[PDB]
């Protein structure tokens, strides 16, 4: 597990598991707008499973105040991932909560995020968004399985 | 150090160092803040409508007749001082405007002024700010409301939890018809008035 | 907090109250001047404080000339002075500054000065309230070569109110008592169509 | 009993009995003219006896210094009393010390008002004015009596 | 010492911020000006100070000449002036500061104002911070005979930063939200020629 | 108040008001369908307001197990209210929990209903009736109001 920033906030939702290509860019979701005044944490949870003859390494990280240069629960797709699609070099990515997803070691990853706002409560605000960008590039033998699927679930904590 | 013979008006030798002047006395009643003065009711003006400029005197009260029939809606407004409609006319809206942020919750009192043998029932309901005025009695019993009864009481106050600086809206319905026995007068007149609560704050000082 | 709300706060920030062209000029002193703060000042009926005026001189057109002035104050029972060269601008006991025009502006402060114990906005009765009254010259016996244009600026201090009275609404006729057009009267507030919305 | 501004002053005198018809606008009295150095208090109260069958709401408030745009025992009347014949709004008369003669309710209102000036000692002065305000105009049925009368009892207080 | 790298440290040293030339001009305060100090604040996201300005004004070739001026504040909810006889530029509820040109320049800091707790440079949502607005103009009635231009700077002081983000590398486009070229994108590093050196 | 068999069950929602004229026969209300595993009591309230000129006599009584020989909020009205148009006479539904809303007299009427089913927990059954008989008809003289309005308040107690 990894703490946002040291600070603990004070049901299991999954969404749909997208597709992991050997040519997909990235994945982005937005919140809390992906669960559908407010004031709640969360806690974020990605599993990837898949076969011990494939390779590859996903970076996950959360991002608060994540604007673009309304997904919903399916999600988006990056354009160009090596800026993050918002100018900042993806290369530097990790001064934000992270985690790895290296697929010859543990294949999940959990963050928690409490509450960063600058008012003490709040449904047109998203909050941080949540990114999955694809590294190292996936590669495979031919025969196996073209496509690696990816689950998301989200779980709010202290919300009011 | 730069900043030196600038006039800074928001920012003395005395002329007359012999004079002493007039010691004060005790004339009663005095104010230390404008908090105290945002904290009277007074008349709101909810029959601003446009044929009424001519003559001025019946703004202050909104009717009630028995030709209206039951579960209709009577008389609709926001929940903002600072803008113009019915809450120019009171002290608090008056005073909002000479300032630019304001927070806190309101009072609303309504006064029945009709005859003492008539009875009957109003339902008042306020929405919170976000949403849409209701279109049915039925649905507006759902949120916060108050009924009143002028049969027995003839006055009661309503609370508006909170206000900010997309507004509420507050509305006054007809929960039975207005019934009267023969001999008394067929209409009857409302009178609505508004105050602050003890937690209402003005931040930052403007010109109106 | 509560603090941004009180009687002291709300009568700060000194703001210009009167402005005076020279092509001697008298100027006395009065608050129910410029519309904005008589309004301010009527909310309430007896009103007790002290002023802090300021005079910001320059020729028109902006530029500054080395120039000797006189600003010269008058109590509420004293002769006003009447020409150029009178005994008033000599007699010594109502207070004069002088100050040269490239120099920053003179700061002088005026006593709470009157008879009674506040000042009175309203009087029911038949004859009061006179503050005193300045004078503004050109040191010289003979006539200056250029014309000055000045503003007085003035601020309130240590302000005490009394018995609160509702505020106005109707627009002002005269400078001294409250007469309105009694044939056009404006109402408060503005007006819809209907009263169901 | 209202005490105005919550200061105890330190025979009954009754006045001529205004009617009130169905299109009145109002009356006001001055004071202490109306019982024609001086420093005194004063009780003011005002009684509106009607029927049950009538309906109305008057408005009794007291004005310090009330200026005009020396009426004596009878009164007078106003001219426009939205603008109070003074410029000031009726809808915030309420400010001043006050009271309601809800005919549906009690229909009596007594005022306590303590010595308000400038100087410890004071005829020609008049202190506060009193105004009577017919804010819900009064209606009944045909064949009721047309006018309601309204007392008004003055007694000084503390006087020296 | 550590002490040289401190967030307080990091923001000082007051410097240009906008030049303005008056051949009445408004000027609103915006942090986000000039790339050099956009992509330093750019670093983190909540940022909470105040500021200090100084105006040191001059005619071009650079010579002073005996000018008075003015320079106002406009608070953020206010009505900006439209002429150079506007009510805006008599009001006092917005302070302003008068100083000759020969004088030294006129200093002035203004506080934290926001209705929240904090600056956003990032705002996800849709409609918020503005600082407010200064307002210069020569005082008089008639037209002034000579050509002015004045530069401003500002010092940040007692500085607070909160999440931390990526740094910029893409050149900006607008001066309101982030838009890159998106079909040049310049990289980060330079480049070899062969991964051995 | 009077309690339904002496038993305690262990918002406010206001229903339309009936007008009741002069030739009217009656209504009756079916619950739990007016509000709309279930297990809940109910807290009846009915309130009848009339001028002192007006006189009648109501007869608010709860049924269980209420059969005819699904209205919903607005109600019904019965055809033959001699026989409740259920084969049972009137004159005898005195046995079950009642109110009188005699008009000379209190105007109001509640009535506390326990849960009483055959089985510990229960949308298609409708567990009892709520009749209001005007077995007195109503009288008035030309002139005054000729619909008196009923109001009806209910209060689920105890649900689960």
Known sequence: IVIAYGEWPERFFTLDTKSWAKDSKGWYWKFPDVLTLYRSGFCVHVQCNASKFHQGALLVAVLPEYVLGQPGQVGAVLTHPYVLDAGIPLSQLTVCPHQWINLRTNNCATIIVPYMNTVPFDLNHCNFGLLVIPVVPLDFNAGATSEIPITVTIAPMCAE | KPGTNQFLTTDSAPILPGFHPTPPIHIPGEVHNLLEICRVETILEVNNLKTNETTPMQRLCFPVSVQSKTGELCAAFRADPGRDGPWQSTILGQLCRYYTQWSGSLEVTFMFAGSFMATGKMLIAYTPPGGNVPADRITAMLGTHVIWDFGLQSSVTLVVPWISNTTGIITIWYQTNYVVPIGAPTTAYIVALAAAQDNFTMKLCKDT | ?197
Not at chain 3, 27 to 38: E, F, K, P, T, V
Not at chain 3, 66 to 71: I, N, S, T
Not at chain 3, 173 to 182: A, D, R, S
């Open chain 3, 1 to 197: 907090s509560t603090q941004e709300t009180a009687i002291g706060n709300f009568f700060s920030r000194a703001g210009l109250v009167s402005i005076i062209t020279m092509p001697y000029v008298n100027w006395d002193i009065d608050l129910m001047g410029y519309a904005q703060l008589r309004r301010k000042c009527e909310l309430f009926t007896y009103m007790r404080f002290d002023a802090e005026f300021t005079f910001v001189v320059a020729k028109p057109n902006g530029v500054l000339v080395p120039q000797l002035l006189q600003y010269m104050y008058v109590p509420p029972g004293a002769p006003k002075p009447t020409s150029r060269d009178s005994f008033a601008w000599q007699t010594a006991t109502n207070p004069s500054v002088f100050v040269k025009m490239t120099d920053p502006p003179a700061q002088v402060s005026v006593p709470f000065m009157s008879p009674a114990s506040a000042y009175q906005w309203f009087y029911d009765g038949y004859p009061n309230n006179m503050m005193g009254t300045f004078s503004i010259r050109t040191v010289g016996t003979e006539k200056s070569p250029h014309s000055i244009t000045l503003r007085v600026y003035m601020r309130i201090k240590h302000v005490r109110a009394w018995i609160p009275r509702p505020l106005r609404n109707q627009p002002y006729l005269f400078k001294t008592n409250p007469n309105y057009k009694g044939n056009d009267i404006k109402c408060t507030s503005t007006s819809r169509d209907k009263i169901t919305t």
